[PDB]
């Protein structure tokens, strides 16, 4: 979750 | 464009031209017809923003004759010719003033 779907990714 | 000239005001109706006898009379007739009791307050010009002006005698409770109110306005004027004089109308159902306006701006 949390950082899996970042704009960074 | 015109420049707006700042001057002291006297609350309700003070932005209209000063009232003649008929316009004053019509307002008192309105207050009596509403079942309000006319009263007269007066105060020194510099104290016009106080909550408590001098009360002229007592409010004319149950006064029906407009000419009696006008006579008492004149009496108050003579007693204090430099005071601002205000006509109030007590509304005992709201315990408020139904109407209030300055009849003489004082000097």
């Amino acid at each position: 979750p949390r950082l899996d779907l970042i704009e960074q990714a | 464009m015109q420049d707006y000239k700042q001057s002291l005001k006297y609350e309700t109706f003070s932005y209209l031209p000063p009232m003649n006898a008929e316009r004053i009379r019509a307002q008192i007739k309105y207050a009596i017809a509403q079942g309000w009791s006319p009263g007269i307050e007066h105060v020194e010009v510099k104290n016009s923003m106080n909550q408590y002006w001098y009360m002229w005698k007592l409010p004319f409770f149950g006064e029906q004759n407009v000419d009696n109110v006008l006579a008492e306005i004149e009496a108050c004027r003579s007693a204090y010719p430099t005071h601002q004089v205000k006509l109030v109308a007590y509304d005992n159902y709201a315990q408020s003033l139904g109407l209030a306006f300055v009849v003489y701006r004082g000097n």
């Binding site: - | 464009m1 015109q2 420049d3 707006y4 000239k5 700042q6 001057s7 002291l8 005001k9 006297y10 609350e11 309700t12 109706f13 003070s14 932005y15 209209l16 031209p17 009232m19 008929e22 316009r23 019509a26 307002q27 007739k29 309105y30 016009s48 923003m49 909550q51 109030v88 109308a89 509304d91 709201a94 315990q95 408020s96 003033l97 139904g98 109407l99 209030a100 306006f101």
Partner: protein
């Protein structure tokens, strides 16, 4: 029911009491219900009574721990709607014990906040709510009300004049105070922050309060009339709201405003109690015919919201404009006004009033008129709202060709000419043009104002 039997059941046998006479202490509600197809009216009315009170979608054993017969909401009458046939009127009584004292929205959200249907209702609309006097006495109500406000500001015999500063956003604090000063010295009783002027980068709230208060004192000294500016204390948190209100009181500001939509009931109720404790007048803005109160078959009617706002507390109340509205809704405008100001409002279906509403000694609230109104609207406004109202002319004042002071004077002259004509017995709405034209002979400001906007 004395015994526990799990499972889904109908609500008609518990929550439909056609022989129930409401107690004087009951909260009464009138719902316009459109039931799901096939569902009987008595069942759907029972479903709304259940879900808005002690009902569950399935039977729970905990019901038997209390007495449902005492606590339940119960529908007691059904009436057809004049015009529609799908909908009907359900009258539901709620025991006063169901609600927190002095928390009128707890009544409101119980009734419609979270009432989806129990699968028997496809359309709900809360038309009227009878708040019993017993409940009214527990609410704070307006911190001062009409009569005390007039005494505090020493204003008698006419509607009060106000004006929102324009543009709505973008002005620095000092420029804001300049606009305020010019309006106030020209003859307005009040100016006000726009509803969404809080504390923005272009104008921080503390700077605005200081410059506005300096503007207010200056214009008051130069006119000899009491002046005010509704300082908007609407804030992201209650601490911030109270802090701004405290600063308003500290610098001597007589009146503040609160956007009820932005802030919410809890903030507003707390603010109104604070205002009574600190002698500050409270202006309330709550837009109606916006999101909540515009849809005629879906939502909460504005008269219910009006009752809530009076109980929650406010010395002024503003929603939308009244003159642009049609002559048909003018009767609804007059009924709206009475709920705000009167002590006892009798039932009158023609105005949308389904119950006698008794306010007892709860003070009335100033009704506020705004919108795109200008001098030409003044006769209608004076006739509709009467003396116990605030007529706010934002664009009508700052849009005057000669600036704020002249615009303020134009509106002030128009207002006093209409009031004087009314007191003389003239029909000011029919004679409006002639009244303004005559007053315009002595007021060049009014004369060009009438030429700026159309009759």
């Amino acid at each position: 029911v004395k015994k526990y039997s799990a499972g889904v059941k109908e609500y008609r046998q518990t929550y439909w009491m056609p022989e129930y006479t409401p107690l004087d202490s009951d909260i009464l509600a009138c719902f316009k219900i459109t039931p799901q197809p096939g569902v009987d009216r008595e069942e759907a009315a029972a479903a709304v009574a259940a879900e808005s009170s002690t009902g569950t979608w399935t039977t729970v054993w905990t019901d038997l721990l209390t007495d449902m017969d005492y606590y339940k909401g119960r529908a007691y009458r059904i009436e057809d709607v004049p015009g529609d046939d799908a909908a009907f009127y359900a009258f539901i009584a709620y025991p006063i014990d169901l609600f927190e004292e002095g928390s009128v929205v707890n009544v409101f959200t119980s009734l419609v906040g979270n009432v989806f249907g129990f699968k028997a209702v496809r359309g709900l609309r809360l038309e009227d709510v009878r708040f019993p006097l017993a409940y009214v006495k527990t609410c704070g109500g307006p911190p001062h009300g009409i009569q005390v406000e007039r005494d505090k500001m020493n204003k008698y015999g006419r509607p009060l004049l106000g004006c929102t500063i324009k543009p709505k956003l973008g002005l620095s604090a000092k420029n804001y105070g300049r606009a305020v000063y010019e309006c106030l010295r020209g003859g307005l009783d009040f100016t006000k922050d726009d509803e969404n002027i809080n504390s923005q980068p272009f104008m921080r709230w503390r700077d605005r309060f200081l410059f506005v208060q300096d503007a207010t004192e200056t214009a008051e000294a130069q006119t000899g009339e009491r002046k005010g500016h509704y300082l908007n204390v609407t804030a992201p948190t209650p601490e911030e709201m109270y802090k701004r209100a405290e600063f308003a009181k500290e610098i001597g500001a007589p009146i503040i405003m609160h956007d009820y939509i932005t802030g919410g009931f809890t903030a507003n109720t707390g603010l109104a109690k604070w205002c009574q404790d600190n002698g500050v007048l409270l202006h309330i803005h709550r837009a109606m015919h916006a999101v909540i109160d515009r849809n005629p078959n879906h939502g909460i009617h504005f008269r219910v919201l009006t009752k809530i706002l009076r109980l929650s507390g406010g010395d002024h109340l503003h929603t939308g404009t009244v003159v642009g509205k049609l002559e048909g809704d003018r009767a609804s405008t007059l009924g709206w006004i009475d709920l705000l100001r009167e002590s006892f409002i009798p039932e009158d279906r023609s105005r949308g009033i389904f119950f006698d509403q008794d306010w007892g000694s709860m003070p009335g609230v100033f009704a506020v008129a705004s919108g795109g109104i200008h001098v030409w609207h003044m006769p209608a406004l004076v006739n509709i709202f009467g003396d116990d109202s605030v007529l706010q002319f934002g664009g009508g004042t700052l849009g005057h060709p000669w600036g704020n002071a002249a615009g303020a004077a134009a509106n002030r002259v128009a207002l006093e000419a209409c009031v004087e004509a009314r007191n003389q017995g003239r029909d000011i709405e029919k004679e409006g043009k002639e009244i303004l034209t005559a007053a315009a002979q002595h007021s060049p400001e009014l004369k060009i104002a009438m030429e700026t906007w159309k009759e």
